[model samples]
Target: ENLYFQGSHVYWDLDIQTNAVIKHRGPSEVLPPHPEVELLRSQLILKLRQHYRELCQQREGIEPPRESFNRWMLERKVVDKGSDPLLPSNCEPVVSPSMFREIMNDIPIRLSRIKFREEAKRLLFKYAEAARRLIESRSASPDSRKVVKWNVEDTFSWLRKDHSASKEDYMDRLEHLRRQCGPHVSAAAKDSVEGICSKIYHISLEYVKRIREKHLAILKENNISEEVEAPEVEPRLVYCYPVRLAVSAPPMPSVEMHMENNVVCIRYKGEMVKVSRNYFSKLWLLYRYSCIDDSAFERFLPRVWCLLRRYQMMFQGSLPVHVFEALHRLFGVSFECFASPLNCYFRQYCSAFPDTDGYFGSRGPCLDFAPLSGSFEANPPFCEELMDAMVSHFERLLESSPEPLSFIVFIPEWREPPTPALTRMEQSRFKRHQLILPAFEHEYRSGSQHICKKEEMHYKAVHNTAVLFLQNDPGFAKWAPTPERLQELSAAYR
Candidate 1:
């Protein structure tokens, strides 16, 4: 479900699948669930990142200088299936700064908060992991024993949620909480309330313009209405359902809507809840646009997807606000490509347009085909075919660009290593790039207002993600999160 608040009173709740929210209420904004814990976590990630970077520098050589400190071992080595791990235990393993941070991730918060050094401790266990795996792969002696797997994902899942929060627990400390006291009792809601009411409103179908250009052209060529359909509503966007639906009306039934600060004190299932104005906006758009029967009562779900064919829709990718912030912190410049035009305003740098339809519309071009010779950021489509092509293209683009380019690219963090698992590090794709250790699965909001909300993401997303960044030539990686960009993200998230 999507949740939004305007003026701290009026609220919106739309179904995640159907995108329809008949009604709901939310408690006013308050401090984050926990404050001190958040602070400790933030400090811990940075402190641990720095400590690991230094450790790798002093420890990378395949030759460990005697008397060197030996931590838990695997915490430092690249877990090699064949031999990527057989490093002369504790030598500086060809690691870069970012990769160093990647490897030493997942440090303790409260436990480490006691002493900064305590924070650096959990990083040890991954090496033994590498060593054990290599021995097992070779099927050699006592070293190669039956090792199913260590319980790693279970722990990272917890840490990711803890680190996925915004560092803004104090923002609400000085603000007051209040509910929207209206479209008051005697308004359209109560006077006509029983099951629903006579206040049933009328909506338009302006969202029809967003149809694919190719389809629009064919419709025009056949004179299938001549021009883009215009609705009684002033503007448009779409949903599969209504925002705040209407009653007491027919032909003009199911009106499209918009909700800014204006909210209605409406009765839902008979309880009072402040609601968004253009509430049933999308539902109305779909109702009228699809030309469904006015008496349509919805009978589409299988309530199960067992037999559904997998289809890759044109997904408007969104970067969680924190992920956006973290990218800037790493590479300085962040650019988004192959996203909807509306999403362009959601982050720092945006390139590429919506779809490759026709002259009737478009962004710049398909980002996978866009120039990657610049400092940009990408949270790409999850569709594997698209990702593979973009990865191949960017690999060539960076190679052709003389300057060592700085960039951050987001990709899934695979819990299971791919086949020939040793290639996961040595002969693998993206090996040249630094694997950003993701915190946990968290939802990101779409640039468009009502659709994607972080509030709904925490419980919904199930994949592990990491923000990957790479520098072509070594000497050119200086970047920092711009203060202005930081404020923009902060205000939006708050």
Candidate 2:
């Protein structure tokens, strides 16, 4: 069954500065001035009645007399208005038909449960009208002082003695009344009821007594009433602002090195230049001998070749070894090769290793070595197989290695299950390994564009991968790696 009510649409055309014609939208015509205002006023009265009934039920175990309930309802509405509106002859009750139906429904059920039928019915109608008029008076005034002042415990105590009610049974009846009243109540009434109920349940009489005694002591000392003045409280002002300095640039040594394929095409010299390979061997030899390391000549040689190849790819003039060494020394890891095994092997031959485990078990395959000599060269089929073997061995090494090692593995973007090489590496170990969905040019070319779009994925991968891997080692872990730690590990190199 669908229930419908007629409501008037009250409009004021502020642009024209005049009241528009009241358009009747539903069943009824000639609604009161500001019909929406009247509807809200009726709803407020119903809420007050419900709140009073709930309080009474908390006092008496069974339902209280409808007369007593209605009387309290009238008293509360009068209190909310700060005046008895029913006493004034001009103020007629403007109770809605819907509100009358609600009161009738509640009165019959409450009367059936209690002994006093005639007295309850007569008082309910009389007081309901008084409550309605009181609602109308207070609701229209913007400056209405509607303060709810009642002690739940004191009221409960009075009703217990007068009606012989059990506390538990009374509480149950109170809960029932709250459920019925909740939908009709205003937010202010609902909040007040919740606060009062919570205070009555949790606050002990001893605490209340102590508070009363303290108030009395203050009143007696000052020769003043408790209601006259509020307590003086010290004003505390808290000052808060962002604890960060706004700088033109970051206060850290940062260098940007642009590379095309395996070679450095451009270098921006800043506070420091970072070399990515084994710094102890590669960087230390240049510092000590003023030349490249003889023992590890093969590994370091190809990087120089790749560096030269990068300059050629950019169509820049070739940099001779002596001139390159002079520039390199000005920054840090300086190098000059003079017909050494590194120079001969890099210029003359490209040694391709077998794909078996044994080949990588000894010394890992060099990353920079390519069959094609002087320009940007793709990895040969054997070179790719050799890298696969080295990656597999590195995974096995991760299980036994006490110090965690972080390495970046580059693969063809078209390869299905993007990190298949890393997946195979995780087979033997139970340690956490994060697959950073590579966001380089290769991944974009493969049509897997969604992975790069996720900015958080890129950020998290770069940050967390180092932390989870190297957290156990003191030297690396002292870096204080978090999800946001993006700084380069250059101090470790130093």
Which candidate tops lDDT? Answer: 1
Once fitted onto the true fold, the runs of candidate 2 whose alpha carbons sit more than 4 angstroms away are 1-384, 417-420, 426-431, 435-481, 486-494
Clashes of each: 32, 0
lDDT of 1 by residue, 1-494 (tens): 44454323112211112211111311111111111222232233334334434543433312222212122122222221111111112223222222222222211100112122222223212322333343344333341132222222333343345544222321211011001111111121222121110101000011112222333344444444322233245333232121121111112112222334554332212322232233233323322332222346331111001001000011134665455554444444434444432233222222221111110111123331334244566665443334554565556655665544544566654556532222222333434444433344355553333333334423323455554544466314444234554345334333
Q: Please identify model 1 stretches exceeding 4 Å from their true place.
A: 1-317, 341-368, 414-433, 436-449, 452-454, 457-463, 479-494
Q: Poorest 10 consecutive residues of model 1 by lDDT?
A: 303-312
Q: Which candidate has the top score in TM-score?
A: 1
User: What is candidate 2's TM-score against the reference?
Assistant: 0.19
lDDT of 2 by residue, 267-320 (tens): 223211122222212222322222222244333323333222221211101112
lDDT of every predicted structure (CA atoms) = 0.30, 0.26
lDDT of 1: 0.30
